[PDB]
Structure 1
Amino acid sequence: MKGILGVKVGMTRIFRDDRAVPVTVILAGPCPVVQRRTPEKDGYTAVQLGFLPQNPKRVNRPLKGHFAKAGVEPVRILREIRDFNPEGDTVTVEIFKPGERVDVTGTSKGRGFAGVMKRWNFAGGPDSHGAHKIHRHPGSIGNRKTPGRVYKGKKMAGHYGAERVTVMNLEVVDVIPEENLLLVKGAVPGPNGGLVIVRETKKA
């Protein structure tokens, strides 16, 4: 189970043989394993990857002691890849080879307080033949005396986006070890400059 942190840089397109291919440029910058998680004393298996360097000015937190207890350069952000025990050093885009496929997690763009119209792609009501104060409205939301309430789950307008999003089975097109770039098939959550983890898929 491979895994590596990165940041969405932006996206354009490249040409495979003689057919264009839209691609998002992840940047799986160098990530120093900061702590291993074994069943022996954690209950589960995983690896605390670090990512992106940090000036000791903010790291004033005894985190310095955490980074110290592993002799690593204090990074800015660190999250765990589960069930993935590498070798005792550092992961690279190298874990991925072209043709492999990856699942990718990110924090979608924040659409704030959303209209049910968009939040749930509803259909509201007539732009014309009447009522005019119910255009982008949800319409009924229940029935009479029975049930007499509303289902826990009812699609209603609220905060939409800025949630955690995993997108499945993207193919790793290119991988440029030179500068730590992962090249995938475009569709990846979060906005540019956003943080994002990338790992092996579940085709099987």
Structure 2
Amino acid sequence: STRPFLVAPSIANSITTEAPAINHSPELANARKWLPKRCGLITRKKGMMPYFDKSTGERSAATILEVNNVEVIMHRTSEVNGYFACQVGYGSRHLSKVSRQMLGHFASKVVNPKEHVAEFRVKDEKGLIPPGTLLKPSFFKEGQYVDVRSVSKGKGFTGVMKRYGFKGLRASHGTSIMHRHGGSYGQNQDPGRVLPGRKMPGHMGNEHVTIQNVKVLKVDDENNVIWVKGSVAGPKNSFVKIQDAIKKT
């Protein structure tokens, strides 16, 4: 029950050898990375209001992050996926809004059809949480510091004065028809072109922003909210992600 196969002498006699460590390998890259140990959770920015520290009586602007129905769906491993991470879902969504494929996926992992799915990358296999398990605000401690990701408000097409804080020109002293313009955009013939990355008018905002080391002020399971000190990027009802911070761990 053999098949007609041949084999070259050059390949048969070739002594076995292991390929060394490539730096652009995923594995190596993983080692390099400065990742958080624990996981995080997805949230919706609801609004902003003032927190009052009752001892010091100090007013802190605080943004409210609502943690509705956050649940780990499934996780990714170094063996299969080349990094360690947990896919977290947020919030319920009506069947009508969800693709058949996505519904199927959700079923596979015994969760409800989610509103927003996002991976949180972690260090080591320890950081992973059992799948199908629910997360509450109680996952964070008051006083601890977190890193927040969200999508900034879109400013549409913006001038150079607003994008990059260019000074524009003088308001009245001869100056004609160019008050808010960017000025020169290059040099003469000895580049003879506009260099890549020249600051120019264009779309601004609606981009990802990571804001680091924000203090968790409060965490109330009874209201499904976390309170974060300061401003978090994006509009009301934008999806936010919070992990425990890396700089102040």
| Same topology, TM > 0.5 | yes
Question: Is 1:8 aligned with 2:45?
Answer: yes
More helix by share: 2
Q: What code does the residue aligned with 1:19 have?
A: E
Conserved 8 A contact 2:87-2:120: yes
1:167-178 counterparts in 2 under 5 A?
A: 167-178=211-222
Correspondent of 1:85 among 123, 128, 135? 128
Query: Is this contact kept in 2: 1:29–1:93, CA < 8 A?
Result: no
Asked if residue 158 in structure 1 is aligned to residue 202 in structure 2, the reply is: yes
Q: What secondary structure is seen at the aligned counterpart in 1 of 2:218?
A: strand
Number of residue pairs the alignment of both structures matches = 204
TM-score, reference length from structure 2: 0.78
Distance in 2 between the 1:151 and 1:171 partners?
41
Partner of 2:21: none
Q: Is this contact kept in 1: 2:169–2:181, CA < 8 A? A: yes
How far apart, CA to CA, are the structure 1 residues paired with 2:169 and 2:88? 50
Structure 2: state its 5+ residue gaps. 1-37
Among 26, 29, 34, the alignment partner of 2:65 is 26
Query: Is 1:131 paired with 2:149?
Result: no
The structure whose residues are more often strand, as a share, is 1
Aligned to 1:147: 191
Q: What's 1:40 paired with?
A: 79
User: What is the root-mean-square deviation of aligned Cα atoms in Å?
Assistant: 1.3
Q: CA–CA distance in 2 between the matches of 1:179 and 1:70?
A: 27
What SS does the corresponding residue of 1:171 show, helix, strand or coil? Answer: strand
Matched to 1:183, the amino acid is W
Residue identity in the other structure for 1:74: P
Name the CA distance, whole Å, in 2 between partners of 1:189 and 1:68. 32
| Structure 1 partner of 2:155 | 111
Q: 1:60: how far off?
A: 4.5
Which segments of 5 or more consecutive residues in structure 1 lack a partner in the other structure? Answer: none
How far 1:159 sits from its partner (Å)? 0.3
Question: How far apart, in 2, do the equivalents of 1:173 and 1:145 lie?
Answer: 57
Q: Distance in 1 between matches of 2:188 and 2:94?
A: 62
Deviation of 1:31 after TM superposition, in Å, equals 1.1
Q: Distance in 1 between matches of 2:107 and 2:50?
A: 42
Deviation at 1:29, TM superposition (A): 2.1
Percent identity between matched residues is: 38
Distance 2:188 2:104 in 1: 62
Q: Could you tell me which of 56, 71, 96 is aligned with 2:95?
A: 56
The one-letter code of the counterpart of 1:41 is V
The range that moved more, 1-10 or 78-87, is 78-87
Q: Please, what TM-score do these two structures have when normalized by structure 1?
A: 0.95
Higher relative contact order (CA 8 A, sep 6+): 1
**Alignment partners' CA distance in 2, 1:146 and 1:59:** 56
